[model samples]
Target: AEDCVGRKACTREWYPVCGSDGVTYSNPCNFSAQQEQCDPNITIAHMGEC
Candidate 1:
């Protein structure tokens, strides 16, 4: 899959998602933002807090 690029304005939702790097993203948008700013190779480990 292609890596997320550029900045994005994510919503303040509470649907947490676990990242492959063991980080709990606030939501999918937040996860994508992290990918764009941090590690692009990080995938969703699960659809919940880590």
Candidate 2:
């Protein structure tokens, strides 16, 4: 089990969304924030980790 996990903890809520990369985002909003910082063109791949 990885302790570091992934992405920043913007809130206490749990949504479990995946980004364009391998790491999983906390939610769509969280992913969007990261995308803007890294890949502005990169959109969300899916929801609830497929």
Candidate 3:
């Protein structure tokens, strides 16, 4: 049989942890962290938290 996969939740999106209050950033890329970004999934301009 063949199987198909799809995006699971917000796993594809990046999230900040350091200093975060246990809240998923609404706009991860909107802010920068130590010269790094929050959105690692879509934010390609800067290096995000890995």
Candidate 4:
């Protein structure tokens, strides 16, 4: 995203993005971190929770 400032786990702000696999992440980069414990290779399909 043009606004995504990379993954910073120390903040409380929410960005809410959808993963290619259909999981809703709090932020786009959160999906990337999810890959550490999840399968299915998470990728940002778009921004926002909608």
Candidate 5:
């Protein structure tokens, strides 16, 4: 998943987002980073916690 690699820097904000996998990420960057590493098929389900 080279397309999802790199850009490892992210802010420490509390902005939350819900993932398609029924998980809550701390922020957009956190969600994207997780997606890059593990859930390649996952996506943001909403703008808040699941």
Candidate 6:
């Protein structure tokens, strides 16, 4: 994302951005929007938006 501490989690919970944007992926479980979930049931180590 625009800014990350490299510790926050990433999630596809980003809903349709209601501000001149399309439904993009977001770290809903990062910015305190929702609790971190164990989706895909797999622990992945990938980089998000830089």
Model 2 C-alpha lDDT per residue in residues 1-50, reported as the tens digit of each score: 22223465455566877775666777766666666566555556777753
Write model 4 residue lDDT over 1-50, tens digit each, in one string: 32333343423457887777666677655666665556445567788753
The pairs that clash in candidate 2 are none
All models, RMSD in angstroms: 5.1, 6.2, 12.9, 8.9, 5.0, 12.6
- Weakest 10 consecutive residues of candidate 2 by summed lDDT: 1-10
Q: Regarding TM-score, does 2 or 6 come out ahead?
A: 2
Q: Which residue runs of candidate 3 sit more than 4 Å off their true CA positions?
A: 1-19, 30-50
User: Model 4: runs farther than 4 Å from truth?
Assistant: 1-11
Of 2 and 3, the candidate ahead on lDDT is: 2
> What C-alpha root-mean-square deviation, in Å, does candidate 3 show against the real structure?
12.9
lDDT of each residue in 1-50, candidate 5, tens digit only: 54543223457887888778777777888888877776767777899865
Model 4, global lDDT: 0.58
Error of 1 at 49 (Å): 1.0
Residue 16 deviation, candidate 4, in Å?
A: 1.0
- Please give, for residues 7-30, the per-residue lDDT of candidate 6 as tens digits: 244565643221111112255344
Per-residue lDDT, model 3, residue 28, is 40
Clashes by residue pair, model 6: none
Runs of candidate 1 exceeding 4 Å displacement: 1-11
Candidate with more favorable, higher TM-score: 4 or 5: 5
